[PDB]
Amino acid sequence: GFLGAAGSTMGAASMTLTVQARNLLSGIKQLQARVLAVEHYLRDQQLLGIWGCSGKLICCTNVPWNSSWSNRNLSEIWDNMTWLQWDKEISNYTQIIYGLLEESQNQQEKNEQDLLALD
Amino acid sequence: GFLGAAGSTMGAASMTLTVQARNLLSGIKQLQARVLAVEHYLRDQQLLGIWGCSGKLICCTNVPWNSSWSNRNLSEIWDNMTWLQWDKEISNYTQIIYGLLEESQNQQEKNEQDLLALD
Amino acid sequence: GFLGAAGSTMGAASMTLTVQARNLLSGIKQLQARVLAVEHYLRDQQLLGIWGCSGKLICCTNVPWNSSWSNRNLSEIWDNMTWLQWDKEISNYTQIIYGLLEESQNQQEKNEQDLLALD
Amino acid sequence: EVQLVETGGGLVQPGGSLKLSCRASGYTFSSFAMSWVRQAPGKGLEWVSLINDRGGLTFYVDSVKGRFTISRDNSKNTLSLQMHSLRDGDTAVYYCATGGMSSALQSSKYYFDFWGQGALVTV
Amino acid sequence: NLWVTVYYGVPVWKDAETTLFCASDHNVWATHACVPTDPNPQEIHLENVTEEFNMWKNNMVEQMHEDIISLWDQSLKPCVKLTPLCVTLQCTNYAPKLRSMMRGEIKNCSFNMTTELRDKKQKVYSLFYRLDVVQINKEYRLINCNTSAITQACPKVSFEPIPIHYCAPAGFAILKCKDKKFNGTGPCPSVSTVQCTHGIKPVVSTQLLLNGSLAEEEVIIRSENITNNAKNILVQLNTPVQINCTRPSNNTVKSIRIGPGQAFYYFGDVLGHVRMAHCNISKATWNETLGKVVKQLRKHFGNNTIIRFAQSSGGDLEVTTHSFNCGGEFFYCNTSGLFNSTWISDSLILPCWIKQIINMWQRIGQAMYAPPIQGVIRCVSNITGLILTRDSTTETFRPGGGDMRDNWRSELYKYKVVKIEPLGVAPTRCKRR
Amino acid sequence: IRSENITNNAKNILVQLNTPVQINCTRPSNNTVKSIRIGPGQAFYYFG
Amino acid sequence: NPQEIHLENVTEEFNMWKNNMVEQMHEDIISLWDQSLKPCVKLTPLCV
Numbered sequence A, B, C: 001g002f003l004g005a006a007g008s009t010m011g012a013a014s015m016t017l018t019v020q021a022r023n024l025l026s027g028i029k030q031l032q033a034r035v036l037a038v039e040h041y042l043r044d045q046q047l048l049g050i051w052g053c054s055g056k057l058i059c060c061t062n063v064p065w066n067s068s069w070s071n072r073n074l075s076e077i078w079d080n081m082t083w084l085q086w087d088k089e090i091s092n093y094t095q096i097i098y099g100l101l102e103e104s105q106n107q108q109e110k111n112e113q114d115l116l117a118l119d
Numbered sequence D: 001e002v003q004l005v006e007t008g009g010g011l012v013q014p015g016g017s018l019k020l021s022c023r024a025s026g027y028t029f030s031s032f033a034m035s036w037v038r039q040a041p042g043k044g045l046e047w048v049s050l051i052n053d054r055g056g057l058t059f060y061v062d063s064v065k066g067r068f069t070i071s072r073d074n075s076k077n078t079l080s081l082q083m084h085s086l087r088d089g090d091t092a093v094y095y096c097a098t099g100g101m102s103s104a105l106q107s108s109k110y111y112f113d114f115w116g117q118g119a120l121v122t123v
Numbered sequence E: 001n002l003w004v005t006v007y008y009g010v011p012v013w014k015d016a017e018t019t020l021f022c023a024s025d026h027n028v029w030a031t032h033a034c035v036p037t038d039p040n041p042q043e044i045h046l047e048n049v050t051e052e053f054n055m056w057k058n059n060m061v062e063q064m065h066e067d068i069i070s071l072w073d074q075s076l077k078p079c080v081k082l083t084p085l086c087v088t089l090q091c092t093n094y095a096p097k098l099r100s101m102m103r104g105e106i107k108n109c110s111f112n113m114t115t116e117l118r119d120k121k122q123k124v125y126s127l128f129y130r131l132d133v134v135q136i137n138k139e140y141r142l143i144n145c146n147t148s149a150i151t152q153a154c155p156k157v158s159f160e161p162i163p164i165h166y167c168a169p170a171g172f173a174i175l176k177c178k179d180k181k182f183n184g185t186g187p188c189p190s191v192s193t194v195q196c197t198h199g200i201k202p203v204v205s206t207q208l209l210l211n212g213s214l215a216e217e218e219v220i221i222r223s224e225n226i227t228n229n230a231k232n233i234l235v236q237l238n239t240p241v242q243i244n245c246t247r248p249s250n251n252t253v254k255s256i257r258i259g260p261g262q263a264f265y266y267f268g269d270v271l272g273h274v275r276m277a278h279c280n281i282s283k284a285t286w287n288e289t290l291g292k293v294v295k296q297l298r299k300h301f302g303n304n305t306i307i308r309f310a311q312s313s314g315g316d317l318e319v320t321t322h323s324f325n326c327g328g329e330f331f332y333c334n335t336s337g338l339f340n341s342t343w344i345s346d347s348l349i350l351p352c353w354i355k356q357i358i359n360m361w362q363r364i365g366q367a368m369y370a371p372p373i374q375g376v377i378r379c380v381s382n383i384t385g386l387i388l389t390r391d392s393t394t395e396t397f398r399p400g401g402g403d404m405r406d407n408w409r410s411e412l413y414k415y416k417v418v419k420i421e422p423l424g425v426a427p428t429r430c431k432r433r
Numbered sequence F: 001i002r003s004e005n006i007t008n009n010a011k012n013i014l015v016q017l018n019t020p021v022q023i024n025c026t027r028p029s030n031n032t033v034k035s036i037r038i039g040p041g042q043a044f045y046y047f048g
Numbered sequence G: 001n002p003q004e005i006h007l008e009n010v011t012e013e014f015n016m017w018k019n020n021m022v023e024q025m026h027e028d029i030i031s032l033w034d035q036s037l038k039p040c041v042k043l044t045p046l047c048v
């Protein structure tokens, strides 16, 4: 169900992303609400685009983990914490992570162009 | 031309998908109509996304054909049927196929993540 | 900055595509303006999709340059000309390139489907 | 005019390591791709490694892929080569050179346009 | 050996006309469909970029016009419509025993007002300005009676202009010429991209441009065709001239009920002396400013050509006089002494009349009644430009005026709206697998 | 001949012809027109 | 048919006095009231 995994651990919750994603699209003020929802959806799709993640729900990238953002171990993060707790844990670093992802994808695309140029 | 292949066989009609794709996008009720057209377009694009087909008109998956949905051979389906007749013959199965496609993409994404995890 | 590289050479300006991509998504007439902006964005994304570029910002294709569109050498184009001048220079050829890109992608997708069909 | 000068260490032993460094002048360093090549007294010219203009991409001959690293510092206009094991068959005069590759916004090169003086690596 | 590479995010734009957003950090100029301005608006200079501007083809002015008309109509709808006011007026002179030049301008009229109950009438006495009352042919009627019903503006709504910032919708951008001595048309080599314009005060005036922008260096004369006498000439000053305007007479406002919850306000007894409203401009400042305007005219028309100024005495009073909103009250100032010089190779008093019934934007059929304002009114405004029109050995021209779009154009002359085209192609040495 | 149900007398029959029939209709009288003002900005027009 | 799902191990903080649904409820109800009574008889002749 929608948000059914919200209280589950991050690992278990990672298996329910499809239902939550599919329910994101589902006088003047309601039309404004529909337009705003579309704009937010497209903002998320464009953010995935500039990172090279537009084609999938789970997209691995080439940006390493800083460890200053959070020093919890992998097992702790995925098996003990919930996604709300994780969001709080790194709420101060989102604008840095997104910028690094943007730079990484830009370098990846330029590298692909240079590799394709080889005869 | 737009829908020119509607009466053509499925095989020949598969070569005209570009025209319909471009023709899906081309006073309060006029704005409402445009918003609804956008919502339907985005629902279809998200549905292709969850299937891993966001960038293609034709994409293959790993989901097998049940054969109970339709026991016609490929020659009969592609040469002796129109898309309208095919759509009618599987009208009771479409949502089952959609569910299987979503599960297949979820398994592919998790398997891809695990393969990428190997050094 | 938005359009900060607009006066830069095409080569230098190619490194700021993500600034434009991010910024382009930043009483009834105002809602109409927002909906039209969304429709233009979606038409551009659909146009990239039909070409098979998915979410890539720099998309390399299989369509050769004819040289009748512009006979400048690569170095002159990228180092001694801006995007405004270049876009004006080839304004009469844009729809031909777009048609060639759509045909090339349709052939590529059919070839990929046939390759996948091989056991 | 354009100058390119190889520097680095001299005598090495098998199993060790050696860093070579090339200083460039007379042109924009970051505008050209570069490579490392070697000339042994008993051999002809051979290519060892290739680096792009940015430095993101590196290529090596199969015989050194597991030991050699090519890198560049664009702000210092300096090309570096880190070598390991330094086998007897690796004794040669090493050179760095400009050219050999292009960004795909500049015309095709695939040639070594400017060669340095060279430095002798003796095992 | 080259292939087509498709780029998304190309900094290329094309000319386009679209809807602009209102931004502003009750007042009739405050649009409800308007958001706060950016706390830190960005201005990004475009180096090595030249853009062709044309103030006479700028579609931002038409949007500002439509926005102001819509805003005022929406603001006046929820106000009392003065339908019972068009009645026979028994009028005399308020203060005939005066020696000032104001005598005879104010009429003391008596009428009936319908009270609140339909079966009762209330005899009422009030004062009106001469220019608002016409004899029926003593018996007088309101000037608007043969045009339309007149709506009373809500007195709680201020008319003081609020700077309005125009912001591009997503997908579009605003370019600023940002070029000293730009004449309104042609290439601008100093183009800067702004998300929103600076605040434009929606000041309503004729002949003189008030509370506007100044020229960066010198006086700038802008015209669609400088040699076409039929085109309006907009002169932007680089040295603001202060104008001291006042309605020195005192006032009180009476209030009666005319319907079920509909109150009507009217001018009452004048306290102290009865004196005519007027404006003050120092003579030396005007002489020097006008000399600068003449120097620009010499640049355009020749050094030895005789230049003559004259008043636009013909036409409607709303055009022949200066229309000035002083403290919320509408002044109609003669100001003929400002355009009386001839040029070859202590202070001035500008009489003003007061009107309570006005017709804005030359829209015949939509009269508006201005409420009276208590007390004595004094204001100081900046003259930042002039409007001139022209009718050879001698070149004679007049202030002209009478079209609000030019005033907004005067402020918006330096902005253009363009659509962003993120897609483009270029040859590269690459090929898709 | 079009109908929802050609034998149901509660519905209309819509007949589309295969030939036009020209019809010339007129008001032959030469009528006077007058106009008056009835209120501020309001006017009534009437047959004279 | 309603659709709801219980969230186990979720401890959300609520504040009924900061909820913007109350303002929408109020605005919508007054809007419905005012709009529904527009096409009705205004009793001007009763103020006599």
Ligand SMILES: *[C@@H]1O[C@H](CO)[C@@H](O[C@@H]2O[C@H](CO)[C@@H](O)[C@H](O)[C@H]2NC(C)=O)[C@H](O)[C@H]1NC(C)=O
Pocket (backbone or CB within 6 Å): E244, E245, E246, E278, E279, E280, E347, E349, E378
């Ligand atoms: C415009 O200038 C005249 C001077 O010609 C001002 O008139 C004086 O106003 C003061 C105000 O207290 C009086 O005390 C003087 O007796 C007036 N003198 C004359 C000769 O009129 C007038 O007030 C000025 N108006 C403005 C708005 O500045």
Ligand SMILES: *[C@@H]1O[C@H](CO)[C@@H](O[C@@H]2O[C@H](CO)[C@@H](O)[C@H](O)[C@H]2NC(C)=O)[C@H](O)[C@H]1NC(C)=O
Pocket (backbone or CB within 6 Å): E092, E094, E108, E109, E125, E126, E127, E268, E269
């Ligand atoms: C307008 O004129 C009327 C009469 O023409 C004024 O009414 C009279 O004013 C005098 C002033 O002392 C009184 O003594 C009378 O009793 C008034 N008569 C009535 C019937 O009211 C009226 O005051 C004038 N209006 C103004 C503003 O001066």
Ligand SMILES: *[C@@H]1O[C@H](CO)[C@@H](O[C@@H]2O[C@H](CO)[C@@H](O)[C@H](O)[C@H]2NC(C)=O)[C@H](O)[C@H]1NC(C)=O
Pocket (backbone or CB within 6 Å): E160, E161, E203, E204, E210, E211, E324, E325, E326, E327, E378, E379, E380, E381, E382
């Ligand atoms: C031009 O700007 C001046 C300065 O704000 C305006 O004058 C002020 O108007 C307000 C309105 O209530 C008064 O409270 C101030 O005391 C006035 N100050 C001065 C120095 O006059 C003036 O009204 C503006 N002009 C127009 C046409 O809007």
Ligand SMILES: *[C@@H]1O[C@H](CO)[C@@H](O[C@@H]2O[C@H](CO)[C@@H](O)[C@H](O)[C@H]2NC(C)=O)[C@H](O)[C@H]1NC(C)=O
Pocket (backbone or CB within 6 Å): F024, F025, F026
């Ligand atoms: C319809 O037909 C009648 C006669 O069939 C027309 O009537 C004639 O109109 C003319 C017009 O000047 C007269 O001079 C004749 O005397 C009329 N004759 C009769 C018998 O009425 C009538 O005008 C026709 N109307 C139209 C619209 O065609």
Ligand SMILES: *[C@@H]1O[C@H](CO)[C@@H](O)[C@H](O)[C@H]1NC(C)=O
Pocket (backbone or CB within 6 Å): A004, A005, A007, A008, A009, G007, G008, G009
């Ligand atoms: C809540 O915690 C309990 C503890 O074991 C767990 O069994 C349950 O599945 C958790 N809830 C969810 C939605 O995962």
Ligand SMILES: *[C@@H]1O[C@H](CO)[C@@H](O)[C@H](O)[C@H]1NC(C)=O
Pocket (backbone or CB within 6 Å): A065, A066, A067, A068
């Ligand atoms: C971790 O973040 C800090 C932030 O100041 C940065 O200095 C450091 O280099 C980062 N480390 C890595 C490995 O990214």
Ligand SMILES: *[C@@H]1O[C@H](CO)[C@@H](O)[C@H](O)[C@H]1NC(C)=O
Pocket (backbone or CB within 6 Å): A072, A073, A075, A076
């Ligand atoms: C990971 O963090 C949890 C948090 O309590 C801790 O119990 C666990 O031992 C940690 N594991 C490692 C390997 O650090």
Ligand SMILES: *[C@@H]1O[C@H](CO)[C@@H](O)[C@H](O)[C@H]1NC(C)=O
Pocket (backbone or CB within 6 Å): A088, A089, A090, A091, A092
């Ligand atoms: C975020 O920063 C604020 C101070 O700026 C600090 O109080 C808060 O604890 C930080 N939160 C996290 C998750 O780092």
Ligand SMILES: *[C@@H]1O[C@H](CO)[C@@H](O)[C@H](O)[C@H]1NC(C)=O
Pocket (backbone or CB within 6 Å): B007, B008, B009
């Ligand atoms: C229509 O049917 C005829 C039958 O002979 C066939 O030749 C033709 O190709 C068909 N066309 C389409 C579009 O189905």
Ligand SMILES: *[C@@H]1O[C@H](CO)[C@@H](O)[C@H](O)[C@H]1NC(C)=O
Pocket (backbone or CB within 6 Å): B065, B066, B067, B068, B069
């Ligand atoms: C085909 O559909 C039937 C329907 O019940 C199902 O029982 C059967 O398992 C399906 N077979 C395959 C291979 O999907």
Ligand SMILES: *[C@@H]1O[C@H](CO)[C@@H](O)[C@H](O)[C@H]1NC(C)=O
Pocket (backbone or CB within 6 Å): B072, B073, B075, B076
């Ligand atoms: C397909 O099936 C039909 C009957 O369902 C049969 O007549 C036809 O020959 C079959 N074709 C092939 C290629 O199996």
Ligand SMILES: *[C@@H]1O[C@H](CO)[C@@H](O)[C@H](O)[C@H]1NC(C)=O
Pocket (backbone or CB within 6 Å): B088, B089, B090, B091, B092
């Ligand atoms: C779908 O189910 C309905 C249920 O009555 C049936 O009438 C129809 O023929 C079915 N269609 C298919 C293709 O199974």
Ligand SMILES: *[C@@H]1O[C@H](CO)[C@@H](O)[C@H](O)[C@H]1NC(C)=O
Pocket (backbone or CB within 6 Å): C005, C007, C008, C009, E047, E048
């Ligand atoms: C503009 O031209 C000057 C001329 O040399 C150059 O130095 C500068 O880098 C250029 N800037 C851009 C953004 O093109």
Ligand SMILES: *[C@@H]1O[C@H](CO)[C@@H](O)[C@H](O)[C@H]1NC(C)=O
Pocket (backbone or CB within 6 Å): C066, C068
């Ligand atoms: C290149 O341009 C010429 C000009 O007529 C045209 O004939 C030719 O077909 C074009 N080739 C391609 C591949 O577009």
Ligand SMILES: *[C@@H]1O[C@H](CO)[C@@H](O)[C@H](O)[C@H]1NC(C)=O
Pocket (backbone or CB within 6 Å): C072, C073, C075, C076, D107
């Ligand atoms: C590009 O063409 C111009 C045209 O004269 C020429 O001067 C220039 O040298 C050419 N550059 C290359 C790299 O071919």
Ligand SMILES: *[C@@H]1O[C@H](CO)[C@@H](O)[C@H](O)[C@H]1NC(C)=O
Pocket (backbone or CB within 6 Å): C089, C090, C091, C092
């Ligand atoms: C494009 O067409 C216009 C006329 O429509 C012509 O003036 C211009 O030179 C053409 N440009 C090219 C590159 O063909």
